[PDB]
Amino acid sequence: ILGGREAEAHARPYMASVQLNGAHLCGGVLVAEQWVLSAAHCLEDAADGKVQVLLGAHSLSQPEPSKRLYDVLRAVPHPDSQPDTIDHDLLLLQLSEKATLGPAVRPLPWQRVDRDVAPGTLCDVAGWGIVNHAGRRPDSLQHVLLPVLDRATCNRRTHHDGAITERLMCAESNRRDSCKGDSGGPLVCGGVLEGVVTSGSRVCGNRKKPGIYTRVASYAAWIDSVLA
Numbered sequence: 001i002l003g004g005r006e007a008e009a010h011a012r013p014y015m016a017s018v019q020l021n022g023a024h025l026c027g028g029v030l031v032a033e034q035w036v037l038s039a040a041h042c043l044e045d046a047a048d049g050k051v052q053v054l055l056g057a058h059s060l061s062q063p064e065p066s067k068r069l070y071d072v073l074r075a076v077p078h079p080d081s082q083p084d085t086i087d088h089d090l091l092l093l094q095l096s097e098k099a100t101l102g103p104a105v106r107p108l109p110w111q112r113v114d115r116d117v118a119p120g121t122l123c124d125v126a127g128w129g130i131v132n133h134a135g136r137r138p139d140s141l142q143h144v145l146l147p148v149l150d151r152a153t154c155n156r157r158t159h160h161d162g163a164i165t166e167r168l169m170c171a172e173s174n175r176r177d178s179c180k181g182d183s184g185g186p187l188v189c190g191g192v193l194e195g196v197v198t199s200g201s202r203v204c205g206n207r208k209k210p211g212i213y214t215r216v217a218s219y220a221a222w223i224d225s226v227l228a
């Protein structure tokens with residue numbers, strides 16, 4: 001998270017860390033007791049290794065009572081996802097067993113009604129992604145409040161040149177943004193999951209290239225289908 005604050009310890013119980021060989025790769029959001037929603041390209045450059053979801057954390061390294069590592073029993077990518085495109089950049093991970101729910105582990109209600117988030121709405125994106133352009137990996141959870149940018153502005157040739165589909169949404173990127181490793185993370189507006197940070201390689205902190213987030217309500221039927 002570029003230009004953000006450190007998150008309040010365990011204030012976002014839905015928050016998950018998709019890790020490979022004890023190193024954080026992507027953010028994730030607990031959508032059900034045994035399901036974590038993330039991005040489709042998080043396990044791409046992955047070598048022979050242990051893929052695990054960390055729940056109940058604030059610090060990745062320090063011990064916490066709430067912290068629990070889970071094995072990925074099933075990794076369901078969106079059928080229409082491709083490595084080449086940021087479209088349908090969703091991946092549902094089923095945990096080895098149901099998550100032990102508590103004040104620090106609670107699934108987030110995700111938007112089921114397909115309505116665009118009103119441009120200007122202040123949304124909260126959190127993650128353990130790089131905090132500076134030098135690539136400093138934060139140990140503790142970080143977050144930033146970004147206003148939703150309208151698709152028309154986002155699709156300008158100077159911006160994303162029509163790449164933002166009706167299934168995607170945007171947020172402002174002037175210094176304050178989401179970045180590398182924030183991918184797969186949640187975009188929460190009014191305590192409800194609206195977007196998922198894309199795992200597509202982009203350029204953070206520049207206002208002319210806004211943040212791209214996959215609208216969950218746009219893929220509500222697929223999520224429902226998988227979780228059942």
Ligand SMILES: O=C(Nc1cccc(Br)n1)[C@@H]1SCCN1C(=O)Cn1ncc2ccccc21
Nearest residue numbers: 025042128129130179180181183199200201202
């Ligand atoms: O690269 C990734 N994770 C990573 C790398 C270094 C440091 C940290 Br913290 N996390 C994940 S796994 C493969 C796709 N990923 C992305 O973060 C993709 N992505 N998402 C935004 C972004 C910006 C610049 C470059 C890549 C970007």
